Amino acid sequence: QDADKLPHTKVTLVAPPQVHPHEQATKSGPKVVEFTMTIEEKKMVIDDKGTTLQAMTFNGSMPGPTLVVHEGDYVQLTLVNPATNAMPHNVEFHGATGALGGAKLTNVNPGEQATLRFKADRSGTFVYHCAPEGMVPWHVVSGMSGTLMVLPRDGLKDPQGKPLHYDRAYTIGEFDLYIPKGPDGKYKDYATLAESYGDTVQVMRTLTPSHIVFNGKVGALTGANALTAKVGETVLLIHSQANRDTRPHLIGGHGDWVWETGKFANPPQRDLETWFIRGGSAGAALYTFKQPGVYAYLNHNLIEAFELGAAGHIKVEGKWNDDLMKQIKAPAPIP
Amino acid sequence: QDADKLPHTKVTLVAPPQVHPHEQATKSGPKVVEFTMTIEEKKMVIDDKGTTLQAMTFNGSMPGPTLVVHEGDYVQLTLVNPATNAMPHNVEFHGATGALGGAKLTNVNPGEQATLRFKADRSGTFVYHCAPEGMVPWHVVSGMSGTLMVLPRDGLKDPQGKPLHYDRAYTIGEFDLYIPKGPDGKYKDYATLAESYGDTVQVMRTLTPSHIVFNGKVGALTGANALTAKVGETVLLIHSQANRDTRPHLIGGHGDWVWETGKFANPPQRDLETWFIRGGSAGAALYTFKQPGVYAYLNHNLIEAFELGAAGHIKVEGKWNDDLMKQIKAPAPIP
Amino acid sequence: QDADKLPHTKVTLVAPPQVHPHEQATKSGPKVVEFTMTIEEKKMVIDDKGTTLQAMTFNGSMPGPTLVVHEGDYVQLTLVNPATNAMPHNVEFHGATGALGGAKLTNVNPGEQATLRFKADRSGTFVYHCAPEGMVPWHVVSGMSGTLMVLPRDGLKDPQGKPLHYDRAYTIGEFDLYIPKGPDGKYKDYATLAESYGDTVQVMRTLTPSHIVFNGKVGALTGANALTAKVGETVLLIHSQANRDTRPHLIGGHGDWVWETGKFANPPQRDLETWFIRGGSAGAALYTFKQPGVYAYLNHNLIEAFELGAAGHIKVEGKWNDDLMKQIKAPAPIP
Ligand SMILES: [Cu+2]
Ligand SMILES: [Cu+2]
Ligand SMILES: [Cu+2]
Ligand SMILES: [Cu+2]
Ligand SMILES: [Cu+2]
Ligand SMILES: [Cu+2]
């Protein structure tokens, strides 16, 4: 169909780690699904010792919100760059075809907005990110990325075509940060975004992140902000990394079905311990919880997780199952 | 079945690179398979110039021994932490479900042991590793990991369901080491394990290994300690990397059938030149030798292999096959 | 068949990024396909500020030329090392079986040549590279690698066995460079290849490239040297990385069908945003262009691409398609 003649619907986005309400399988025909995002440059505290990042975001969060459509829908995004920001921005959708993913059609200076439509003709999770000419990696590593999820119209399927369903989706964006230090060995704090640029590029070129965080900060997805589930619930874990490889893992769980390259027309793999999200992509894993307790969800380069920040928690309620795991003898003196 | 009512068998572990005797396909029903491992902290010489590592091991080796069961069996491990060690330890099994892979149920201080049971309900090679709260990557990178192999009850299969069989299994654990240097440019030698901690964490956070070794040392799997095979023999090469990505390769061979994500319910890929083991996982490759000679088996980041240590040898006996490869003209002056 | 009795054909190689003319599906039976390559050591300017590399090449280019045969053919390569070079060289073919991929049979000192035959019995793209004993990574990272493509005799196929065809093939070799700096912070320029060795090994061991280039230089595949296509044309993008992982991506496009591990007997994946070439391998992607414009083809570690060099351009002619993408509202003041 011709999109100019199709029904339009508007979606209200929600902040990560939640994902806006949506259908999996749907009886709906194709639609033009309208979204708006407003860019916010802001200084953020990214660790427990007061380190700040001169950050750049879609909609005020790292990652930006996840946008969900169905295959054959059109995405119609209005991108707003308020006059309170300093930099130009745009958006590149890996789910889109042409014009550098839309970036060439969405260059907005502070004070401007633009509206892009594209056909979401390929199913999968896809990164979107800012990509202004001449300063692409800086905008990405400063926070400007998120996920577009294009569901098959009949929902997710296993390799034999059997339906897969989730009860809850969570979106995790993983951010390799390049925060400069000064000659005193302390992280720098900058009064403006522009002042951070040159020093940050030098750190970037070392390819060594200072921090690697989920969802904007060390510990973002812990404590009151842990992810939650129950025994018996199936969760979809969407993982985006717009710049650098990562290897997600659920400690004490598995990826029951995983699309690590993130593209739902391909059969998923089962029983994964650790999967691989290529830098510049989003992938997705399903898991049905079978044990209660506090899980970790992390990048299984354990230095990247525990030393640099790429780890969160999932608090799961329900009944312990001694068939799956039992302590036969508790720690006690060696006989 | 209820594991409390199933038959128990005990397995005697063997040191890497061998793997304890086991069946592939079996007529046996599910069993509770009992293993014991004893933690040994020890100083190890890890290269040819006398560099030492304040190491931590399961059963005295890097990697720990490979444990082999069949899908539907239960693993029942007694983990012993003698009083001669300095640190607490535990074990996390990626093949297990719940309680942080078992780590929460196996915290043993020096002088203690504990016994864990879990259902091995998913086929594949899976990493196990130590994970004590607050010092997880240090224990892993100091040597505390190995593989659990859960074979399908009817043995390995190709993508069409045809049986695959191996004559010999070898287990290779690859270890990214973070050995500190002092201000004189020499690697540090520490009198105790605890004294090594702070300096090692700083090196870890650079994400640059000093050494990357197979099986505990540069050259571990070379010379008298080369792996061996014959023309016509099919070998299974199990490769674990509990912390960091690697890319195994057999020079002059291939991965005939490879499960790079390591999970046997998924179809393997064929004819691989180089495969990919995500940090935090174990994978497996089958190869049937067709030529004699000394092969290298290595990580094909060739700097990681030849400069940092991640390479071994396979000495293969038998008859050379000029159909597969022939020197037509030996090196000689250019006409 | 016995290769000694088969027909021989000679192929004239062409420089990257082109690939010599070849059939996809063929009615031909197996042949011994003869190639010659001549090693050239030379100083190359690799960036826009005059940095030089003491380089090493097959046939004068980075990468070496792509060699194309069909499964069941034999490759018969004459490798020539002129007396004007300083170092010994050889060749290792990942597509070959035995004798360290051929390296043991092709050790040529300056002034020598050798001829190797092997059976190309496995379909796929495969790296070939130099591997002289004791200095393997140096020769690889200095430029000595390329691709052997072994096509199935009936051409490429999708997961259901349907024929896939390309109109044009391009070959991209990605090179992680390790150029030393002196104490003044400037890149070193060396009068000879041998003088560069020790300093380069120290940089290599940091695992941090100074530059990461396609096809020999920052910007090699841009401007007059951009890749070209038209709307409606299907291109095969061959990507080799003999030493280090990379993650190819076509901005504004996709991998329609991708063999990221590069082995054509395995089913390809569809709709990829970003794929993964393991260090030590070659992979291949098909894409049919649907929009005109200047695309980027890059490594989607965006620092590696935009800061270090791993990016090129594809200039595509034809008609813009507003169904796939349309600017609904151009950048304008915020209402
Ligand atoms: Cu931006
Ligand atoms: Cu992108
Ligand atoms: Cu431990
Ligand atoms: Cu783990
Ligand atoms: Cu060479
Ligand atoms: Cu190689």
How far, in Å, is the centroid of ligand 4 from the Cα of B280? 6
Residue A38: phi and psi, rounded to 5, are -120, 125
Q: Running DSSP on this structure, what letter comes out for residue B64?
A: P
Adjacent-strand bridge partners of B295: B314
Which amino acid is it at B210?
S
Q: How far apart are CA C202 and CA C180, in angstroms?
A: 8
Q: What is the token pair recorded at B201?
A: 């964490």
- Torsion, CA A108, CA A110, CA A111, CA A117, rounded to 10: 20
Decide if C279 touches A, using CB distance below 8 A.
no
Length of chain C equals 335
Which residue in C273, C291, C328 is closest to A115 by CB distance?
A: C328
Strands laid side by side in the A145-151 sheet: A67-70, A145-151, A124-129, A92-93
- How many residue pairs bridge chain A and chain B with CB atoms within 8 Å of each other? 168
Which residue in A83, A98, A111 is closest to C324 by CB distance?
A: A98
Residue B152, CA distances (Å) to A180, A273, B71, B95, C308 in order? 50, 17, 5, 13, 46
Which residue in A271, A295, A325 is closest to B118 by CB distance?
A: A325
Which amino acid is it at C282?
A
Q: How far apart are CA A23 and CA A28, in angstroms?
A: 10
Count other C-beta atoms under 10 Å from residue A178's C-beta: 25
Q: How far apart are CA C155 and CA C71, in angstroms?
A: 10
CB burial class (10 A; 0-12, 13-18, 19+) of residue B68? Answer: buried
Q: How far apart are CA C41 and CA C48, in angstroms?
A: 21
Find the residue in C nearest to A80 (Cα).
C334
Task: List the end-to-end C-alpha distance of chain B, in Å, as a whole number.
Answer: 75
How far, in Å, is the centroid of ligand 3 from the Cα of B244? 18
How far, in Å, is the centroid of ligand 6 from the Cα of C290? 36
Residue A138: phi and psi, rounded to 5, are -60, -45
- Torsion, CA C31, CA C32, CA C33, CA C38, rounded to 10: 180
Decide if B49 touches C, using CB distance below 8 A.
no
Q: What distance in Å separates residue B328's CA from the closest CA in chain A?
A: 43
Adjacent-strand bridge partners of A228: A315
Name every residue whose Cβ is closer than 8 Å to that of residue B98 and which is 6 or more positions away in sequence: A252, A290, A291, A293, A320, A321, A324, A325, B118
Q: What distance in Å separates residue C177's CA from the closest CA in chain A?
A: 13
- With contact defined as 3+ CB pairs under 8 Å, the chains touching B are A, C
Identify the CA nearest to B143 among candidates B128, B133, B124, B154: B128
- Judged by CB atoms closer than 8 Å, whether chains meet at C114 and B254 is answered as no
- C292-319 burial, b for 16+ CB within 10 Å, e for fewer? bbebbbbbbbbbbbbbbbbbbbbebeee
Residue A176, CA distances (Å) to A243, A308, B136, C34, C207 in order? 8, 9, 21, 48, 18
Find chain C residues with C-beta within 8 A of A280's C-beta: 247, 249, 273-274, 300-302
Whether residue C159 is preceded by a cis peptide bond, meaning omega within 30 degrees of 0, is no
- With contact defined as 3+ CB pairs under 8 Å, the chains touching A are B, C
Find the residue in C nearest to A83 (Cα).
C334
Q: How far apart are CA C128 and CA A34, in angstroms?
A: 49
How far, in Å, is the centroid of ligand 3 from the Cα of B90? 6
Residue B177, CA distances (Å) to A144, A292, A301 in order? 34, 35, 13
Q: How far apart are CA C78 and CA C91, in angstroms?
A: 10
Q: How far apart are CA B130 and CA B242, in angstroms?
A: 10
Q: How far apart are CA A42 and CA C32, in angstroms?
A: 64
Q: Please, are residues B121 and B93 in contact by the beta-carbon 8 Å criterion?
A: no
Q: How far apart are CA B90 and CA B109, in angstroms?
A: 9
3-class secondary-structure state, position A87:
coil
Whether residue B110 is preceded by a cis peptide bond, meaning omega within 30 degrees of 0, is no
Find chain A residues with C-beta within 8 A of C260's C-beta: 261
Q: How far apart are CA B199 and CA B217, in angstroms?
A: 21
Q: How far apart are CA C43 and CA B57, in angstroms?
A: 48
Residue B300, CA distances (Å) to A165, B37, B253, B277, B304 in order? 39, 32, 13, 12, 8
The H or E element that residue A36 is part of is strand A32-45
Q: Please, are residues A130 and A56 in contact by the beta-carbon 8 Å criterion?
A: yes
Alpha helices in C115-172 (DSSP H): 136-141
**For strand B145-151 and strand B124-129, is the pairing parallel, antiparallel, or unpaired?**
antiparallel
Q: How far apart are CA B151 and CA B24, in angstroms?
A: 7
Q: How far apart are CA C239 and CA C203, in angstroms?
A: 25
- How many residue pairs bridge chain A and chain C with CB atoms within 8 Å of each other? 168
Adjacent-strand bridge partners of C212: C176
Domains of chain B: 2-152 (2.60.40.420), 153-319 (2.60.40.420)
Q: How far apart are CA A262 and CA B140, in angstroms?
A: 29
Q: What distance in Å separates residue B317's CA from the closest CA in chain A?
A: 36
Identify the CA nearest to B289 among candidates B217, B227, B245: B227
- C116-131 burial, b for 16+ CB within 10 Å, e for fewer? bbbbbbbbbbbbbbbb
Q: How far apart are CA A196 and CA C16, in angstroms?
A: 40
- Judged by CB atoms closer than 8 Å, whether chains meet at C205 and B308 is answered as yes
Query: Resolution of the deposited coordinates, in angstroms?
Result: 1.1
Adjacent-strand bridge partners of B108: B89
Q: How far apart are CA C121 and CA C104, in angstroms?
A: 20
Decide if B313 touches C, using CB distance below 8 A.
no
Decide if A207 touches C, using CB distance below 8 A.
yes
Find the residue in C nearest to A1 (Cα).
C323
Residue B278: phi and psi, rounded to 5, are -65, 135
Q: What distance in Å separates residue B294's CA from the closest CA in chain A?
A: 33
Identify the CA nearest to A13 among candidates A149, A164, A166: A149
- Judged by CB atoms closer than 8 Å, whether chains meet at B98 and A291 is answered as yes
Q: Please, are residues C136 and C87 in contact by the beta-carbon 8 Å criterion?
A: no
- Judged by CB atoms closer than 8 Å, whether chains meet at A276 and B278 is answered as yes
Q: How far apart are CA A105 and CA A75, in angstroms?
A: 14
Decide if B314 touches C, using CB distance below 8 A.
no
Q: Which ligand is nearest to the CA of B300?
A: 6
Q: What is the CA radius of gyration of chain B?
A: 21
Q: How far apart are CA C31 and CA C117, in angstroms?
A: 12
Q: Please, are residues C135 and C200 in contact by the beta-carbon 8 Å criterion?
A: no
Find the residue in A nearest to C277 (Cα).
A278
Q: Please, are residues C213 and C240 in contact by the beta-carbon 8 Å criterion?
A: no
Q: Please, are residues C71 and C123 in contact by the beta-carbon 8 Å criterion?
A: yes
3-class secondary-structure state, position A275:
coil
Count other C-beta atoms under 10 Å from residue C142's C-beta: 26
CA angle in degrees (0–180, nearest 5) for A248-A60-A9: 90
Task: List the end-to-end C-alpha distance of chain C, in Å, as a whole number.
Answer: 75
Q: Running DSSP on this structure, what letter comes out for residue A250?
A: E
Find chain B residues with C-beta within 8 A of C114's C-beta: 327, 329-332
Residues 80-139 of A with CB under 8 A from C: 80-83, 92, 94-109, 111-119, 121-124, 126-127, 131, 136-137
Adjacent-strand bridge partners of B214: B174
- Judged by CB atoms closer than 8 Å, whether chains meet at B112 and A333 is answered as yes
- Judged by CB atoms closer than 8 Å, whether chains meet at C252 and A99 is answered as yes
- Judged by CB atoms closer than 8 Å, whether chains meet at B98 and A321 is answered as yes
Q: Please, are residues B259 and B216 in contact by the beta-carbon 8 Å criterion?
A: no
Q: How far apart are CA C79 and CA B222, in angstroms?
A: 30
Identify the CA nearest to B69 among candidates B93, B115, B34, B38: B34
- Judged by CB atoms closer than 8 Å, whether chains meet at A136 and C335 is answered as no
- Judged by CB atoms closer than 8 Å, whether chains meet at C112 and B251 is answered as no
Residue B130: phi and psi, rounded to 5, are -75, 150
Q: What distance in Å separates residue C129's CA from the closest CA in chain B?
A: 11
